[PDB]
Amino acid sequence: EASLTGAGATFPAPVYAKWADTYQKETGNKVNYQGIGSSGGVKQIIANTVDFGASDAPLSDEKLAQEGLFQFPTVIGGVVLAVNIPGLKSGELVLDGKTLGDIYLGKIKKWDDEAIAKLNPGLKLPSQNIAVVRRADGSGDSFVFTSYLAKVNEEWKNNVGTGSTVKWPIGLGGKGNDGIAAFVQRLPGAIGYVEYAYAKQNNLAYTKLISADGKPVSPTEENFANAAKGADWSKTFAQDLTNQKGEDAWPITSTTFILIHKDQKKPEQGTEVLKFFDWAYKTGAKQANDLDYASLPDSVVEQVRAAWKTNIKDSSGKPLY
Template identity: 65%
Template sequence: MKLRYITFLFVFSSIFLITASAFSSTNLTGAGATFPTSLYSKWADSYQKKMGAKINYQGIGSSAGIKQIIANTVDFAASDIPLTEQQLLKNNLFQFPTVIGGIVLAINIPGIKSAQLILDGKVLGDIYLGKIKKWNHPEIIALNPEIKMILPDQDIAVVRRADGSGTTFVFTHYLSKKNPEWKAKIGEGSNINWPIGLGGKGNDGVAAFVQRVPGSIGYVEYSYAKQNSLAYTRLLSTNNQSVTPNLTSFESAAKDVDWTHSFAQDLTDQKGDNSWPITAATFILIKKTPKKTNDRRIDVLKFFDWAYRYGAKEAHDLDYATLPDSVINQIRKAWETQL
């Protein structure tokens, strides 16, 4: 059934969302990606204070979130894995992006500070294959001649996700682009057969391992590295330029992407001297047609419409890049025409 009143909803929302008397008792549940958990929690808190509606979001991993929305046990799911048109059709789902963020390599190497160490996709893949075992390996030194004297003769402790993860999907997708052996032997996916590594649950679990284990390296969403005061590396871009992860380099990776035909865009290894190589959008999934009773999709869309309108500062404060206005307008149009 089309949501015929949705156009009215979004014309009205600019007034509705700032009217104190418009408080709602609606409680919504969402689950999925840990990548945007800190932001969704912040948005939910602000939305409840402004609107009175409670949003309960649990960061349980993209794979688990997808399972829950398919099973109709949550009102919305979040995933860093963009589903294909076939997957969306099969499971009666609609998907749209919310924000853009970066996956960084957090490290715990004595004497090495943030953005001091440079890696590239080939070396990174060899580290996660177990081929490069020491921090003073010749290939790492070749990328870091200025700090070669302080790179320790220390074993590399590899940390990765233990659960089904969209962050893992994006990370392994990048490795598959840059390291042919990784692509041939391991490939990409949300839950792969890791050749080595300590497994942490969620971005917070990986960050905790890196924090505790000297000589370690792990991939986490940028805000988790910052929140846990972890050092992180630079990476070489596809233009062979050294790039530091930050809001500007995430935005650079997304600036030339064409969202017109599909919201499922790959932002990894984009052109541009300052484009962070492991950038990704994160997505919301809702049912395309409602249950027979109590259609709560309107309440989900109210929340994310509010976030698009008023949540940019909170997103930027947590180092997530917001979508271009043109893309947000496309999303609202898709809500009107496809739901």
């Protein structure tokens, strides 16, 4: 009976809890998970009050090196644009990065706006006014979305930038992916970024987006993984998956991180933690896929394995994997 306990990000709480349940059936081992938020994830691990911490945004190599930690990504998420356009069927409209930053900056007011029209040829675009809905409460999705726009729009980067809360130029602010969709459903012409999972079993209509390499892409679990496929990875792990170059890569992808110390004062634990996550990197895939999370491509699973082999050592120099 290994008794593990973690704390952190709420994003993957449902899949970690799924993976956990299934790992006990099989091992009788138990991974408790405190869905407390990314901040407490890092605060608890550094405090050495839990076996592992979990956070959405990756810590810098400097700060990892200072607290004595290592990050490894487990699952991949995705943010889509929920739209309310009269007539338009889900996945029909294709957007741009510049064009999208322009909608969010207020430079674009009508859906039948030329700029959107040249991106959608056989489309009866309406003379409907665009309604922007950004996130009310400070959040990692806003952090992720502004990261996206900051790369693709020269203006947004220079006047509002990126973070969990920014100086939004326009648009209503809704609380949680709840607040956004709800308004979006409630208002014709509305547009609000939302997690792909929430959008999906709540039948939010979404858009395709133009990939960093041109080709328009639909958000699917496959295309979220492709973004990760496109990151260097080797010596960093703190990767941003937005506007990732490659083929069929959903331009707005995110992953979440697990934080464990390198020197294990209780190596009983470290070992037992690495195991749970290895079992998930194998058997746990489908459990995650069916909760709308993309799995981590194998090239990257392979790179964490090596990195484990050379980083988590017990109190006396012996590797734990």
